[PDB]
Design a protein around this nucleic acid. Structure first.
Lengths: 126, 88, 66, 50, 104
RNA sequence: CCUUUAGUCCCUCGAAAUUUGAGGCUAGAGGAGAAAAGUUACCACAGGGAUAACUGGCUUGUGGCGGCCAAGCGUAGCGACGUCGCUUUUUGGAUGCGGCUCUUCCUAUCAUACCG
RNA sequence: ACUAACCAUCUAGUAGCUGGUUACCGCCGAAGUUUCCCUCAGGAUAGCAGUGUCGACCUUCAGUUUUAUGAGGUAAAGCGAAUGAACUUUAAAUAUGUAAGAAGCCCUUGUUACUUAACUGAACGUGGGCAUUCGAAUGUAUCGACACUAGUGGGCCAUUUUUGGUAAGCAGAACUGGCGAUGCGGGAUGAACCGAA
């Protein structure tokens, strides 16, 4: 794997190799790299203080770091909005460029035919 | 207080010569004292500092003279060994 | 001076960690004897006395001979 | 009170006790209120109440 | 074990009293289900302290060498066993007796 | 260079006669170099860190260990009361702050009273 | 050969230690901590509080939720899906890191001393696209930078998570909460309890 400077990497921490062993607090963490070496990578991490947050620097080698794709989803959203915006302008109709927080559901009727409800006791005995 | 052997202190040339010093961390060649004369001279020096202070001038002179004679015999025997191993 | 500063800073953690390491050692020793007991119960082929060598090496040599 | 409930109360504008507000039912708001469950009483108001 | 021994300067100041010394143990043979009083030959491993196993301290779960001659255990080659391993499985400090189970 | 491990029962030497020991082979495990190095729940000295009192519905009359049995819990493991084995059997000094007077209380009562 | 006592003065000798250190009201208000240097009767940086100057305007911001995606596949259902916690279509509970816009994405071709077989790639620029929902919710008692100044560098208890241990005690890490600087109601009474400032 090839990693450049400025990208975002997730840390997995596998037990195969004891070299470059990070702490359990740095295990399963996400941060940004600042230094790249032959084998180890310098990563900027955010640590939680008892009342605040600080920025630390850790040295983790290749076998623990992998790329992330949260920014991939963000760029997917940007492209999706751009394409819908262009298409809506071309067709002369308005569209929602927003995303919705999943509003509650509407009223509906459910039939009983061929779906007769079954009565249940508090405990299943058989 | 720490020992001058522990500290990496270089040897300093004074009225007492440093001589040909040996490199650090390397093989300091072992010279063996198994000759009766060499044991005599080492023993004479040891007894000299063990006895120490003597009021009599002649006694002090004789102590120094026996050490000197031990060194003389040691040197003679070593030179003889040198000659023996160089010719035969 | 710097070494002794580090010692004073980490004094107690060393003590608790050594206590834990000794507990782990006791667990390991009890395990190895339990393995010895189980193997003797299953089967085993000895002499008149026990091996005169140290117990840890004696036990290992048996658990490797099988 | 833990900091997460402390922040949710600040954002729901419930700074004092007996301090009701109106909230639009939604996934995000419902999750906030469900986290702040141990401190508030909430329900569905009617026309007379409003 | 012995009585008038001179200990190394390493251990010379460790005093082990007569009231605390033990010489025989109640050793249980499981398969030939029987408990007999047997002399203690040596202390092989106290799993709590190397200093204890050097001093001969008898604690719970402690491997000792026991004379099993009276049992008449026949070995594979046909010989009678004169020494086996036995684990102290009681608390001799709380119980005024030493109880061992024989590892056979 | 010797030692161990498993193998063909493949070869030599030694021994005893109707069997062994030591080597031999296959491949795992042990042993920059006379300057010194590593190591220890050990000792002595010196120093540093932690801890700094401690018991406070505590305590009393019936041991511990292993087996058998074992209502159950559980679906192998925990397991009481008993019984068996060890301690343990076929002829009868220990101890290394004490002592005396008086008040009051407790009962875990030596005497006096009454009972089985 | 060599190297006591009292009086006045130097002397108001030398302390980091002890004791004490003088009206009222109003406003603002802590910390008990990170990191570095060095063996002290400790310094430096950052943090909390405050003052001044400069830039914008809920701009922005946030111990929060949602969406997306990691570390936890942890429980569960099935095996009339395959295979056999180490099985899986699916997937719990539980906390937790990151991202969510003009401080944006691309695509297009001019230069470069970089590079490539090459106007070919990378960087530096140009053109475009959305200024009205500019691209989740809720709140917003504004935020940022520079300069300067004062008091702080102790911990005790408890919930949950977790490591080890005992016959039982217990010992240690992470978060959070209470108490320090907090009055009031209640628990007959009271550092650690409940309600509430």
């Amino acid at each position: 794997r090839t990693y450049r400077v400025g990208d975002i990497v997730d840390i997995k921490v596998n037990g195969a190799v004891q070299k470059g062993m990070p702490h359990k607090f740095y295990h399963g963490k996400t941060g940004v790299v600042y230094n790249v070496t032959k084998s180890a990578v310098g990563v900027i991490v955010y640590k939680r203080v008892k009342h605040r947050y600080i920025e630390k620097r850790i040295n983790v080698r290749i076998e623990h770091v992998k790329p992330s794709r949260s920014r991939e989803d963000f760029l997917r959203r940007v492209k999706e909005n751009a394409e819908l915006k262009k298409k809506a302008k071309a067709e002369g109709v308005p569209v929602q460029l927003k995303r919705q927080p999943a509003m509650p559901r509407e009223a509906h009727t459910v039939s009983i035919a061929d779906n007769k409800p079954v009565t249940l006791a508090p405990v299943a005995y058989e | 207080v720490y020992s001058e052997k522990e500290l990496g202190i270089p040897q300093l040339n004074t009225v007492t010569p440093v001589g040909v010093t040996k490199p650090k961390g390397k093989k300091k060649g072992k010279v063996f004292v198994d000759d009766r004369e060499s044991m005599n001279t080492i023993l004479a020096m040891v007894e000299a500092e063990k006895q120490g202070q003597i009021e009599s001038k002649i006694m002090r002179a004789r102590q120094l003279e026996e050490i000197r004679e031990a060194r003389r015999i040691e040197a003679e025997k070593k030179e003889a060994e040198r000659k023996a191993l160089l010719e035969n | 001076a710097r070494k002794q500063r580090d010692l004073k800073k980490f004094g107690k953690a060393v003590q608790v960690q050594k206590q834990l390491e000794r507990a782990k050692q006791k667990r390991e020793a009890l395990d190895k004897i339990n393995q010895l007991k189980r193997k003797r119960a299953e089967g085993g082929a000895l002499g008149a006395t026990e091996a005169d060598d140290p117990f840890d090496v004696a036990v290992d040599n048996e658990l490797s001979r099988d | 009170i833990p900091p997460k409930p402390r922040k949710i109360l600040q954002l729901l504008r419930l700074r004092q006790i007996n301090n009701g507000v109106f909230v639009k039912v939604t996934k995000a708001t419902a999750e906030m209120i469900k986290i702040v469950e141990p401190w508030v009483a909430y329900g569905y108001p009617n026309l007379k109440s409003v | 074990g012995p009585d008038f021994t001179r200990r190394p300067v390493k251990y010379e100041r460790f005093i082990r009293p007569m009231g605390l010394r033990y010489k025989k143990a109640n050793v249980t043979h499981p398969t030939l289900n029987v408990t007999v009083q047997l002399p203690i030959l040596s202390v092989k491993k106290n799993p709590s302290n190397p200093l204890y196993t050097q001093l001969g301290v008898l604690t719970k779960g402690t491997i000792i060498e026991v004379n099993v001659s009276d049992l008449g255990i026949v070995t594979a080659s046909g010989k009678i066993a004169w020494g086996r391993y036995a684990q102290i499985t009681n608390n001799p400090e709380n119980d005024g007796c030493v109880n061992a189970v024989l590892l056979v």
